[PDB]
Paper text:
The reaction center (RC)−light-harvesting complex 1 ([name]) supercomplex plays a pivotal role in bacterial photosynthesis. Typically, the RC and [name] form a photosynthetic core supercomplex that is central to bacterial photosynthesis. The photoinduced charge separation results in the reduction of quinone to quinol in the RC, which is then translocated across [name] and diffuses through the membrane to Cyt bc1, where a proton-motive force is generated to trigger ATP synthesis. The RC-[name] core complex of most Rhodobacter species contains an additional transmembrane polypeptide [name] of ~80 amino acids, which is involved in determining the quinone diffusion and dimerization of the RC-[name] complex.
Here, we report a cryo-EM structure of this RC-[name]-[name] photosynthetic complex from Rba. veldkampii at 2.8-Å resolution. The overall structure of the Rba. veldkampii RC-[name]-[name] complex is composed of H, L, and M subunits for the RC, α15β15 subunits for [name], the transmembrane peptide [name], and 62 cofactors. The RC is surrounded by the [name] ring composed of 15 pairs of transmembrane helices of α- and β-apoproteins, in agreement with the structures determined by AFM and low-resolution cryo-EM. The RC-[name]-[name] monomer contains an LH ring of 15 αβ-polypeptides with a 30-Å gap formed by [name]. The [name] peptide is composed of a central bent transmembrane helix (from Thr11 to Gln49), a short N-terminal tail and a C-terminal loop. The transmembrane helix of [name] has a tilt angle of 43.0° to the membrane plane and an angle of 68.5° to the orientation of the 15th [name] αβ-heterodimer, instead of being parallel to the [name] αβ-peptides. Analysis of the supercomplex structure reveals how [name] functions as a molecular cross brace to interact with the RC, [name], and cofactors, and thereby plays roles in determining the overall architecture and quinone transport pathways of the RC-[name]-[name] complex. Presumably, the assembly of the photosynthetic core complex initiates with the association of [name] and the RC in the membrane, and then [name] serves as an anchoring site for [name] α/β-subunits to trigger [name] assembly and encirclement. Therefore, we tentatively assigned these lipid densities to PE with C18:0 side chains. The results suggest a potential quinone diffusion route: A quinone molecule enters the RC-[name] complex through the large gap formed by [name] and accesses the position of Q3; the Q3 quinone replaces QB, and the reduced QB moves to the Q6 and Q4 sites and subsequently diffuses out of the complex through the large opening in the [name] ring.
Residue numbers in the entry:
A (entry chain M): 3 to 307
B (entry chain L): 2 to 276
C (entry chain H): 1 to 250
D (entry chain X): 2 to 82
E (entry chain d), G (entry chain b): 2 to 54
F (entry chain D), H (entry chain B), J (entry chain A): 5 to 48
I (entry chain a): 2 to 45
K (entry chain U), M (entry chain T): 5 to 47
């Protein structure tokens, strides 16, 4: 039986340039390419993109942050292109040391460049957030994507903005290296007792696992009912066919309750969004409220002794 | 109590083992042959968990833990209070998980639809079986399985992680984390896009699937498409499961030092070895 | 706020976690009730209202506006299914299968069940018919993979029922959705691409017998297809996966 | 014959049918069970050929003295260590 | 009184199943609570009383 | 004479009477068991 | 009494399936509980009784 | 005449009679087993 | 006595297959319960 | 009559007698096995 | 008269024949190798 | 009459999969023997002929 | 001749012939190589 995992025969007509629903067309590029290796899995069209004020500004600020991280790597390699490549994952642009507190007076190669890059990184993610909002607004769509992105941004900002301010030191923000930010994560768990005994870290993991499991379930369900017009999820929300019914009856017979075509996406939205929302809460409480989650768990009756 | 469209789908057929012997529903739940076996396995495992809890000193459901046998029993069957209850529950868990998948197969056969759901759940089952069977068999002791408890199995995760230094430096672990993070991001974006199209700005007609192609093409330049997003989410989650299982399988069987030292192949490449 | 606790060991952390549990119970209530907009109220096995309806009450009515002058849709609708189902219960109790009273595939029951959708074509964002034969699209062309047109089509018993003569594509999402089969029976037939495997020598359909191909639900027109016709065709093949499985080899 | 037996033979056809069916059920169960046991035994055998440091990992579970059901209150699997 | 009119409200099948499940779980929990307490664990008490039964 | 379950008033009465006999038998067995347990190992 | 009217309420096929499941599960549980107690584990009791059986 | 299962009153009576014979046989065997076990190793 | 009437409710073919499955599973429970006890394992 | 399986009364009696023959054969072989094990390694 | 795999009936027969020959030779040579590695360094 | 299976299953996929499986099985058995310092034909040669 | 490989029976014999020539040539070179290695450093 055909498993709808890969397309068998690809087809292509005139390239699709998008819906016009209040988008400024002069900010939308005009060139599309049609790349058939992608058409085995999904769409083949590498479509146009929209480039307006917010996107341009976000790209400029983010690219400058990226550039500044790179330049710091070059300088700490003592200019060597060999060390630069050998340490592309092991090097990091680190925040100022604890003695500088939250002041903006730390040497340029000991946190100052970290501060400047961090400022421009902050600017670009917020501008990208505004972009996600405004692209929905220009098409007349709801704002669910921007809200979901706000949750992930909330974890990001508690990581490097909110919590270091509440702790009184930039030195607790995460550095900009591939391996050093993993080292940062490990150190963070090690200094706050053990982050497994942080209930919001537990809840964040539950929502991460659940969102992975949920989208295994949902992708498998839609693929299983693809024989019927299944993946046309919109228009099954407003005109229920057998794909939606059989999808509902599978899960009802299996676990005793089911979702609807529209409502499974609310479950997934909330499970995905709750992972960084709950995670940010648990990091924010670490150090500020609880210093040692292990003894806190012992006091609150979920760690023995 | 049937859904208002359910009746026309409640027909005989689709079973694998026992014909019409178990081909009936109990409330919402289809039973079938593997519903009988999954109920029995689940009940016996739960009930042995409760019995093992009774032999301890706490009834707190966050402190109850059933522990695997000590290493000195190797791969033998342990005395029932010295790890044997763990083995009974583990065998019951495998029985129930496998029965659950086979029951899912029968439901798919009755509602003639693809078998993707039991396949994906089998990937989850494989991760579990790697954790409690495959890895401890290669290491030669059931006691390398993880203790059963809401917060004590996290002690297992901690101890095994810190056996190999910082477990972050495990390339398969890195790959698995990226797949978990990415599938969560993809679920967020897919749910958001569907909800945005179905729930427009106030007073506007419902959006089309063209509008959502247009939304991602405007935002990132690419749209995978309606069929593509489900294929993508399915394979992302399945790969996360599989590469996590490979991550843990490699640790203690073929790799034994701190995982950080694995990257010494790159850091000790002879041209920049000494720099 | 370290070590400073409300209530004698109740913290800002304790407060946060209890607050989350309260919010999450409310969100579960909201999510469950949102997911009850189809299929309720629960019925009994004779088409009448069920005695039990569950702990969750139904949500308030919500309306969808449909583009291209296709009215409004309010859910939950409280309406019962708008088709008759030729089944008959096999037991006086509940929880047992209902048996087909005639041909399950022709009647449209079980895995061959179709839902009564509107007898109009699904539309793309510009108001045109979404799924059409390539003779109509006329700017579509095969881009990769092997073209099935002209190949013989082989049923789930190894007998050839005809040849692929046309593809029906989705003009919005650039995809082939149906294969039009010219039958040696004497007529034509649409086969869902999700139910066909294209190979070098033939397209093989392992869900439908050769005798079943003589009675595939027809379309009114050969330039467009309604959602009702789509449901009937796809349901016919998916039901064949049960009601034709004995015709397979061995 | 709209019954899997009609004439039945009442003692021999029925007996052969029942022996065939019960033997089929038992035989498939035996095949599955021995395949699983063989897979586990093969994994243990293979693990015997892994490097010796595959047998150095310490016991990865924490015994909390409130879950210790061995018989003595010590926080460990007694009679071993 | 006239509590029989509960059967005008609830279906007997659902109530009997629910009652059976409830009673089974309650009886199991009470016995387990007794057995976990070494003042009402009858197996060990009999071991003590009869000098290892 | 309407009801949620569709049972008539008479049907509910006989149903309830049989159910009450069953409940009373269960309760009387439980009572005898509790007297035995209390004589053996009093908990109050 | 006239408890036979349970069969006007509960169908015998499902009742017999559920009854078999429950009864076998209860028997297995009780035997397992007895095996875990070192006063009612008959294998070890016989081991002691005969000097290693 | 209340009947959910579809039986008549007579078929229910016959079914219950056979069921009770089965139950009594099972319980008799269990009683014998418990008496033997109590003699072998008493638990009250 | 009248226990033969069980075959009026449960089809004997399916019961035979299911009973084969059940009997083998019961056997494996008992054998490896025995293997769990040191004094009754026969491998060594 | 009460026939879920479609058998007649007479077919059920004959199949029950065959089933009983098979079950007593199985039990007798099991008894021989238990006597052998008990002689070898008695558990009571 | 076309198959699922595209093989005719005749191609299937000769293919199965050579498949059985290949398996027979593989097993026979494996037996010979085990005999040789048993006469050399007995285990 | 078993050859009819090749009208159902594609012989190409089956043959490749069986070949890969047999090859890996042989490879890992050889790795066992070479890991085992009792059969280990190379090293033992360096003792039979005294470094050969 | 729309075969699965697009070949013909006559092309099949010649292609198989060149295949067997190459295969036997490779195997003969391999056997003489193993003979030389065994003489030089027997295993
Ligand atoms: C020794 C290591 C510690 C540990 C320490 C930490 C710490 C420290 C943290 C976590 C956090 C998380 N941990 Mg951990 N954790 C451990 C063990 C585990 C285990 C396990 C099996 O053992 C698991 C499954 C997890 C799981 C998780 C996640 C649930 C959670 C992050 C959620 C999230 O949304 O992330 C992914 C999302 C983000 C990282 C958000 C930011 C991403 C932003 C939005 C990106 C924007 C764009 C970007 C700027 C630019 C580039 C784009 C251009 C295109 C190039 N932890 C142990 C105990 N864990 C976090 C948390 O929430 O804790 C409560 C956290 O901070
Ligand atoms: C000190 C701790 C170490 C560490 C040590 C380990 C170890 C050790 C392991 C992992 C594993 C994983 N870690 Mg790590 N990990 C750390 C930090 C992290 C961080 C982080 C941000 O710091 C993250 C995101 C992760 C992420 C991950 C995942 C890639 C993976 C867990 C998923 C998995 O296995 O699913 C697999 C899913 C399952 C096993 C679920 C199976 C479910 C079954 C089939 C069904 C059960 C049903 C249930 C009984 C039913 C109840 C009934 C009710 C009705 C519902 N780790 C640190 C550095 N990590 C694990 C892994 O890869 O496992 C394979 C693992 O073993
Ligand atoms: C619900 C929570 C999950 C989530 C949600 C989420 N993320 C989102 C969204 C949502 C709903 C978006 O709408 C938004 C988006 O647009 O996605 C497509 C986004 C997105 N989440 C992203 C990443 C991301 N999300 C993550 C996590 C998650 N996001 C959560 C699991 C992670 C993790 C796990 O760490 C990452 C890394 C992005 C793909 C995107 C946000 C886009 C963005 O932030 O843009 C800001 C831009 C920059 C920093 C510019 C970088 C520029 C390049 C470096 C230029 C290169 C130039 C050249 C190579 C040279 C350069 C150097 C010099 C010479 C210039
Ligand atoms: C488009 O499609 C989609 C839907 O549908 C339209 C959906 O519904 C869903 C399904 C997903 C949801 C409804 C969202 C919520 C789901 C989750 C968050 C997943 C987590 C769910 C749980 C917490 C699992 C709990 C449910 C279980 C395991 C049921 C437990 C039941 C038993 C153990 C016993 C079962 C009873 C039996 C077998 C009776 C046997 C009888 C005898 C007598 C024997 C998906 C994925 C979907 O994509
Ligand atoms: C510490 O040592 C030990 C171990 O560890 C080394 C062990 O693992 C174990 C053994 C392990 C377990 C107990 C768990 C794993 C068990 C299995 C692998 C076997 C699985 C058993 C089943 C799935 C059987 C379940 C059977 C049921 C539910 C009964 C079915 C009854 C019905 C359906 C109703 C009646 C039937 C009908 C409808 C027809 C009527 C019948 C006629 C004959 C007529 C033990 C005991 C042990 O102690
Ligand atoms: C021995 C102990 C047993 C329990 C301990 C196990 C741990 C439990 C923790 C998770 C809870 C899982 C239990 C799920 C119950 C499954 C049974 C079920 O849900 O079906 C019953 C009910 C009836 O369905 P229906 O009639 O259709 O409802 C609508 C009609 N009014 O259907 C419904 O109720 C519909 C409502 C759906 C319920 C939503 C499920 C929420 C799951 C989200 C959890 C994710 C976060 C978990 C955090 C974990 C932290 C450790
Ligand atoms: C256990 C002892 C009781 C079972 C013995 C008898 C079972 C007979 C088979 C059976 O279950 O019947 C199906 C039952 C009744 O449904 P029938 O579908 O009524 O017709 C509907 C008419 N309105 O179908 C049902 O409706 C079953 C559900 C009835 C209501 C159950 C209420 C909740 C169940 C317990 C709460 C959940 C806890 C489950 C276990 C938790 C373990 C931690
Ligand atoms: C805690 O762990 C342990 C497991 C320690 C303790 C567990 C104890 C428990 C719960 C044990 C459970 C035991 C049970 C429920 C056993 C049930 C056994 C049964 C019902 C056995 C029935 C066997 C029936 C058979 C084999 C029927 C065969 C019928 C046939 C027709 C076979 C056909 C062949 C022949 C020769 C028929 C004869 C015909 C002629 C004409 C002679
Ligand atoms: C680490 O592993 C250790 C070392 C433990 C021990 C090793 C154990 C091993 C190696 C086990 C595996 C043994 C194997 C795989 C044996 C199988 C050998 C095979 C598949 C032999 C088949 C050979 C085919 C040959 C040699 C044909 C060769 C040459 C040609 C056809 C001519 C040139 C090549 C091509 C492709 C062009 C085609 C030619 C023409 C004329 C068109
Ligand atoms: C100290 O720890 C504490 C924490 C233990 C834990 C819990 C303490 C608590 C809260 C305990 C609360 C316990 C409760 C609520 C107990 C209530 C128990 C009940 C309601 C028991 C009722 C049993 C009823 C029975 C057995 C009824 C009927 C049985 C029959 C055989 C009747 C048959 C019915 C028939 C035949 C109807 C057919 C009639 C017709 C006309 C067809
Ligand atoms: C050839 O040219 C170049 C030089 C391209 C070679 C380039 C090499 C490059 C670009 C190397 C870059 C490497 C890496 C490793 C980039 C990624 C680093 C990582 C792991 C970043 C993860 C960061 C996580 C967080 C939470 C970051 C930021 C969070 C914020 C809330 C930002 C805002 C924080 C502050 C303190 C804003 C400061 C504001 C003021 C007013 C001081
Ligand atoms: C530590 O203590 C723990 C924690 C154990 C907790 C205690 C838990 C307990 C013990 C809970 C409760 C157990 C309970 C409440 C009840 C058990 C009831 C039993 C043993 C019922 C057994 C019935 C056996 C029967 C009915 C055998 C039947 C055999 C037959 C051949 C009957 C044939 C029947 C019919 C109807 C033939 C068909 C006839 C026609 C006319 C179709
Ligand atoms: Fe979806």
């Amino acid at each position: 039986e055909y498993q709808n995992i890969f397309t068998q025969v690809q087809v292509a007509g005139k390239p699709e340039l998008g819906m016009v629903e209040g988008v400024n067309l002069e900010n939308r590029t005009t060139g599309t390419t049609n790349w058939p290796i992608l058409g085995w899995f999904g769409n083949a069209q590498l479509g146009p993109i929209y480039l307006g004020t917010l996107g341009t500004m976000s790209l400029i600020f983010g690219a400058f942050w990226f550039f500044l991280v790179g330049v710091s790597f070059i300088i700490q390699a003592d200019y060597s292109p060999a060390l630069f490549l050998r340490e592309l994952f092991r090097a990091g642009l680190f925040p100022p040391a604890p003695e500088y507190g939250l002041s903006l007076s730390a040497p340029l190669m000991e946190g100052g460049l970290w501060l400047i890059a961090s400022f421009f990184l902050m600017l670009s993610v917020l501008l990208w957030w505004a972009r996600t909002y405004k692209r929905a607004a220009d098409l007349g769509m709801g704002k669910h994507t921007a809200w979901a992105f706000a949750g992930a941004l909330w974890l990001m900002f508690v990581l490097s903005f909110f919590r270091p301010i509440l702790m009184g030191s930039w030195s607790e923000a995460v550095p900009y290296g591939i391996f050093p930010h993993l080292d940062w994560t490990n150190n963070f768990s090690l200094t706050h007792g053990n982050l497994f005994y942080n209930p919001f870290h537990g809840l964040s993991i539950a929502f991460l696992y659940g969102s992975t499991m949920l989208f295994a379930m949902h992708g498998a369900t839609i693929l299983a009912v693809s024989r019927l017009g299944g993946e046309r999820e919109l228009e099954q929300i407003v005109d229920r066919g057998t794909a939606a019914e059989r999808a509902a009856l599978f899960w009802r017979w299996t676990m005793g309750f089911n979702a609807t075509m529209e409502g499974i996406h609310r479950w997934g939205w909330w499970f995905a969004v709750l992972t960084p929302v709950t995670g940010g809460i648990g990091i924010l409480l670490s150090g500020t409220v609880v210093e040692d989650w292990s003894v806190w768990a012992q006091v609150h009756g979920y760690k023995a002794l | 109590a049937l859904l208002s469209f359910e009746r026309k789908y409640r027909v005989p057929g689709g079973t694998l083992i026992g014909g019409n012997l178990f081909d009936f529903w109990v409330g919402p739940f289809y039973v079938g042959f593997f519903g009988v076996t999954s109920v029995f396995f689940a009940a016996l495992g739960t009930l042995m968990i409760l019995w093992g809890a009774s032999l301890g000193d706490t009834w707190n459901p966050l402190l109850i833990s059933i522990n695997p046998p000590p290493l000195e029993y190797g791969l033998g069957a342990a005395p029932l209070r010295e790890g044997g209850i763990w083995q009974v529950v583990t065998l019951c868990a495998i029985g129930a998980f496998v029965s659950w998948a086979m029951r899912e197969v029968e439901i798919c056969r009755k509602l003639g639809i693809g078998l993707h759901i039991p396949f994906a759940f089998s990937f989850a089952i494989f991760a579990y079986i790697t954790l409690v069977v495959i890895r401890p068999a290669l290491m030669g002791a059931w006691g390398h399985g993880f203790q059963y408890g809401v917060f004590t199995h996290l002690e297992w995760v901690n101890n095994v992680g810190y056996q190999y230094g910082n477990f972050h430096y495990n390339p398969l672990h890195m790959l698995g984390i990226s797949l978990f993070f990415t599938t969560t991001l993809a679920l967020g974006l897919h749910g958001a896009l569907i909800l945005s199209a179905a729930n427009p700005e106030t007073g506007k007609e419902m959006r089309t699937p063209d509008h959502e192609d247009t939304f991602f093409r405007d935002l990132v330049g690419y749209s995978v498409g309606t069929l593509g997003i489900h294929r993508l989410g399915l394979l992302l989650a399945l790969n996360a499961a599989f590469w996590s299982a490979m991550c843990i399988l490699a640790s203690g069987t073929v790799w034994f030092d701190q995982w950080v030292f694995w990257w010494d192949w790159w850091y000790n490449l002879p041209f920049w070895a000494d720099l | 706020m370290v070590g400073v606790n409300f209530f004698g060991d109740f913290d800002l952390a304790s407060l946060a976690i209890w607050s989350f549990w309260l919010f999450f119970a409310l969100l579960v209530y909201y999510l469950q009730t949102e997911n009850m907009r189809e299929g309720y109220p629960l019925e009994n096995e004779d088409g009448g209202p069920a005695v039990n309806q569950g702990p969750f009450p139904l949500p308030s009515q919500k309306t969808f506006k449909l583009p291209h002058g296709r009215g409004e849709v309010t859910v939950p609708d409280y309406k019962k299914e708008a088709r008759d189902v030729a089944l008959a219960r096999t037991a006086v109790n509940d929880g047992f299968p209902h048996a087909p009273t005639g041909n399950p595939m022709l009647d449209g029951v079980g895995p061959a069940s179709w839902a009564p959708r509107r007898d109009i074509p699904e539309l793309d964002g510009h108001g045109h018919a979404k799924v059409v034969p390539m003779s109509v699209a006329s700017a579509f062309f095969v881009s990769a993979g092997r073209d099935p047109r002209g190949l013989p089509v082989i049923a789930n018993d190894m007998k050839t029922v005809g040849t692929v003569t046309e593809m029906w594509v989705d003009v919005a999402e650039h995809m082939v959705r149906y294969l039009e089969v010219d039958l040696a029976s004497g007529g034509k037939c649409l086969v869902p691409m999700t139910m066909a495997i294209i190979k070098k020598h033939a397209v093989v359909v392992q869900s439908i017998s050769s005798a079943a191909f003589a009675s595939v639900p027809q379309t009114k027109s050969m330039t467009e297809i309604s959602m009702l016709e789509e449901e009937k065709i796809c349901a016919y093949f998916a039901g064949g996966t049960m009601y034709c499985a004995d015709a397979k080899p061995k | 014959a709209e019954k899997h037996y009609l004439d039945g033979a009442t003692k021999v056809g029925m007996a052969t049918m029942g022996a065939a069916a019960m033997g089929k059920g038992m035989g498939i169960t035996a095949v599955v069970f021995f395949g699983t046991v063989f897979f586990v035994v093969a994994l243990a055998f293979i693990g015997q050929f892994l490097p010796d440091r595959s047998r150095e990992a310490p016991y990865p579970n924490t015994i909390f003295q409130v879950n210790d059901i061995d018989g003595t209150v010590d926080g460990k699997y007694t009679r071993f260590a | 009184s006239k509590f029989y009119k509960i059967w005008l409200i609830f279906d007997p099948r659902r109530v009997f199943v629910a009652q059976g499940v409830f009673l089974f779980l309650l009886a199991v929990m009470i016995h387990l609570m007794l057995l976990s307490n070494p003042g009402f664990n009858w197996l060990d008490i009999s071991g003590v009383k009869y000098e290892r039964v | 004479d309407l009801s949620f379950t569709g049972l008539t008033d008479q049907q509910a009465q006989e149903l309830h009477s049989v159910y009450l006999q069953g409940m009373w038998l269960f309760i009387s067995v439980a009572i005898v068991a509790h007297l035995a347990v209390f004589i053996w190992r009093p908990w109050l």
